[PDB]
Enzyme design. Structure first.
Site, mmCIF file in Angstrom:
data_model
loop_
_atom_site.group_PDB
_atom_site.id
_atom_site.type_symbol
_atom_site.label_atom_id
_atom_site.label_comp_id
_atom_site.label_asym_id
_atom_site.label_seq_id
_atom_site.Cartn_x
_atom_site.Cartn_y
_atom_site.Cartn_z
ATOM 1 N N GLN A 35 1.107 -1.003 0.622
ATOM 2 C CA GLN A 35 0.281 -0.053 0.214
ATOM 3 C C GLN A 35 0.284 0.946 -0.126
ATOM 4 O OE1 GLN A 35 -1.969 1.837 3.451
ATOM 5 N NE2 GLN A 35 -4.036 1.093 2.278
ATOM 6 N N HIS A 80 -2.749 4.185 -1.076
ATOM 7 C CA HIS A 80 -3.686 5.114 -0.428
ATOM 8 C C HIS A 80 -5.081 6.131 -1.257
ATOM 9 C CE1 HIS A 80 -5.766 4.967 3.240
ATOM 10 N NE2 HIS A 80 -4.415 4.361 3.864
ATOM 11 N N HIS A 135 -9.349 7.189 3.387
ATOM 12 C CA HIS A 135 -8.626 7.794 5.258
ATOM 13 C C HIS A 135 -7.945 9.421 5.245
ATOM 14 C CE1 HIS A 135 -8.453 3.327 6.146
ATOM 15 N NE2 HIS A 135 -9.675 3.862 5.762
ATOM 16 N N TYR A 144 -5.823 11.219 3.741
ATOM 17 C CA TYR A 144 -4.507 11.098 3.436
ATOM 18 C C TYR A 144 -5.007 12.219 1.630
ATOM 19 C CZ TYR A 144 -3.477 8.143 7.421
ATOM 20 O OH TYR A 144 -3.317 7.341 8.666
ATOM 21 N N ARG A 155 -7.745 1.828 -2.965
ATOM 22 C CA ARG A 155 -8.345 1.642 -1.595
ATOM 23 C C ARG A 155 -8.858 3.401 -1.727
ATOM 24 N NH1 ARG A 155 -7.896 0.138 4.275
ATOM 25 N NH2 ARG A 155 -9.471 -1.656 4.448
ATOM 26 N N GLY A 213 -8.831 -6.739 9.460
ATOM 27 C CA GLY A 213 -7.372 -5.399 9.787
ATOM 28 C C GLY A 213 -7.233 -5.974 11.355
ATOM 29 N N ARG A 214 -8.160 -6.074 12.325
ATOM 30 C CA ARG A 214 -7.972 -5.865 13.562
ATOM 31 C C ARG A 214 -7.490 -7.854 14.292
ATOM 32 N NH1 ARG A 214 -11.585 -1.834 15.983
ATOM 33 N NH2 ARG A 214 -12.528 -2.348 14.112
HETATM 34 C C1 FMN Z 1 -3.630 -0.254 13.805
HETATM 35 C C2 FMN Z 1 -4.350 0.071 12.515
HETATM 36 C C3 FMN Z 1 -3.651 -0.190 11.481
HETATM 37 C C4 FMN Z 1 -4.476 1.177 10.648
HETATM 38 N N1 FMN Z 1 -3.738 1.421 8.968
HETATM 39 C C5 FMN Z 1 -4.223 1.176 8.130
HETATM 40 C C6 FMN Z 1 -3.436 1.377 7.090
HETATM 41 O O1 FMN Z 1 -1.724 1.607 6.964
HETATM 42 N N2 FMN Z 1 -3.519 1.821 5.648
HETATM 43 C C7 FMN Z 1 -4.666 1.576 5.359
HETATM 44 O O2 FMN Z 1 -6.019 2.153 4.137
HETATM 45 N N3 FMN Z 1 -6.048 2.034 7.025
HETATM 46 C C8 FMN Z 1 -5.570 1.273 7.845
HETATM 47 N N4 FMN Z 1 -6.285 1.102 8.817
HETATM 48 C C9 FMN Z 1 -8.126 0.653 8.762
HETATM 49 C C10 FMN Z 1 -7.442 -1.495 7.978
HETATM 50 O O3 FMN Z 1 -7.326 -1.335 6.537
HETATM 51 C C11 FMN Z 1 -9.555 -1.563 8.689
HETATM 52 O O4 FMN Z 1 -9.902 -1.191 6.953
HETATM 53 C C12 FMN Z 1 -10.147 -1.343 9.616
HETATM 54 O O5 FMN Z 1 -9.312 -1.823 10.624
HETATM 55 C C13 FMN Z 1 -11.566 -1.745 9.603
HETATM 56 O O6 FMN Z 1 -11.524 -3.077 9.688
HETATM 57 P P1 FMN Z 1 -11.303 -4.377 10.829
HETATM 58 O O7 FMN Z 1 -12.258 -4.117 11.949
HETATM 59 O O8 FMN Z 1 -11.236 -5.612 10.066
HETATM 60 O O9 FMN Z 1 -10.162 -4.301 11.660
HETATM 61 C C14 FMN Z 1 -5.766 0.332 10.108
HETATM 62 C C15 FMN Z 1 -6.512 -0.377 11.182
HETATM 63 C C16 FMN Z 1 -6.055 -0.241 12.776
HETATM 64 C C17 FMN Z 1 -7.297 -0.929 13.817
#
Ligand code: FMN
Length: 362
Positions: free
Chosen positions: A98, A179, A182, A184, A231, A321-322
């Site tokens: 990404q 990206h 969010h 950015y 994204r 993600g999490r």
């Molecule tokens: C610790 C953390 C770091 C994240 N870093 C990014 C990132 O680098 N790029 C991005 O597009 N989203 C980032 N996100 C969003 C995640 O990609 C994901 O869309 C979000 O956690 C919701 O999904 P989940 O409920 O499966 O965790 C991040 C989320 C968390 C919790």
């Protein structure tokens, strides 16, 4: 069950539809924003994912907004990422990088020369970013007011994305994810809330999307369209960046434009971590009929929701993600209906192996 069936994703074939979402973890080496052997181990642990999407990675030094986030612009970064992609491939995995520019979600102390970060307009993000203190620990700091990019600086931004994609190919990544979500830089241009420009890069949706479409065209030309994903987070508000008063129509415009390029995938981040209104099935159908590649859904998904929407033909894969932070073998756990390891959010950002490589597999 369709989660565990293969999917062609541009130039590669995923063996399942359980993807690892991009996750900023802020564990890179400074100076140099260099990926580490520890990061290589973390990604290798997760190589059973249908596709790994990396943490957000700088296209340039100016792109940096978080202490500990890696780059893909320097020789030392390219060399370190080559080792990481080789480790994933040794385990028969696939990995996308990404690529971001943080724009106004940044601080002068981590910009080249200690100067103000850049954006579409000179409007503070009114949020915080993550820096490091004197002991290397993650700290939260208010964002610096940005400088509006001059018109003659825009081609340089496009070139930085182009060059980072060339670097990604050399580093052994299978795909790149732009990206454009969010709040950015790319989203800063897309959103009327953050873009008050009166040149051809602000105003109408066509003008607001101009930069991201220039970037898509440049990177397709540099590598190949079947290597490019994007994204977006085009419905709702994300890190104080909303999507304007015509968010649905504007989203469909952007998606139709992206489809013309024949790119590998569209990854939709559906809600902020703090929540948002759910996508309607009607809106999902409108997206689906406009885009001819893979659609990835993300944002608080369960396996059940993923199966429901994949079964309905509305998306092709889900990024978790999490659950991927906490479960390196999430694919096997979901397939077997096993319990998941509990999450430890205090170690999501910064630090070392604890809360990073110490979540066990079954
Ligand atoms: C610790 C953390 C770091 C994240 N870093 C990014 C990132 O680098 N790029 C991005 O597009 N989203 C980032 N996100 C969003 C995640 O990609 C994901 O869309 C979000 O956690 C919701 O999904 P989940 O409920 O499966 O965790 C991040 C989320 C968390 C919790």
């Amino acid at each position: 069950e369709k989660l565990f069936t293969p999917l062609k994703v541009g130039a590669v074939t995923a063996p399942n539809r359980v993807f690892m979402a991009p996750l900023t973890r802020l564990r890179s080496i400074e100076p140099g924003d260099i990926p580490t052997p520890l990061m290589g181990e973390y990604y290798r642990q997760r190589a059973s994912a249908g596709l790994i999407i990396s943490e957000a990675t700088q296209i340039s030094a100016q792109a940096k907004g978080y202490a500990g986030a890696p780059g893909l612009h320097s020789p030392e970064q390219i060399a370190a990422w080559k080792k990481i992609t080789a480790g994933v491939h040794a385990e028969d995995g696939r990995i996308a990088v990404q690529l971001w520019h943080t724009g106004r979600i940044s601080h002068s102390s981590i910009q080249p020369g200690g100067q103000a970060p850049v954006s579409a307009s000179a409007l503070n993000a009114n949020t915080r970013t993550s820096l490091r203190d004197e002991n290397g620990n993650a700290i939260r700091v208010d964002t610096t007011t940005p400088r509006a990019l001059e018109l003659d600086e825009i081609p340089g931004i496009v070139n930085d994305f182009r060059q980072a994609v060339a670097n990604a190919r050399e580093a052994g990544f299978d795909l790149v994810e732009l990206h454009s979500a969010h709040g950015y830089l790319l989203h800063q241009f897309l959103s009327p809330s953050s873009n008050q420009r009166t040149d051809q890069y602000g105003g109408s949706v066509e003008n607001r999307a101009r930069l991201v479409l220039e970037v898509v065209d440049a990177v397709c030309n540099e590598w190949s369209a079947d290597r490019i994903g994007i994204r977006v987070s085009p419905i709702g508000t994300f890190q104080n960046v909303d999507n304007g008063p015509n968010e649905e129509a504007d989203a469909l415009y952007l998606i139709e434009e992206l489809a013309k390029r024949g790119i590998a995938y569209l990854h939709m981040s559906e809600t902020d971590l703090a929540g948002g209104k759910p996508y309607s099935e009607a809106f999902r159908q409108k997206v689906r009929e406009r885009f001819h590649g893979v659609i990835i859904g993300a944002g608080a998904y369960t396996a059940e929701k993923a199966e429901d929407l994949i079964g309905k033909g509305l998306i092709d894969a889900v990024a978790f993600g999490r659950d991927y932070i906490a479960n390196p073998d999430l694919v096997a756990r979901l397939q077997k209906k096993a319990e998941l390891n509990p999450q430890r959010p205090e170690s999501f950002f910064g630090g070392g192996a604890e809360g990073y490589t110490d979540y066990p597999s079954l």
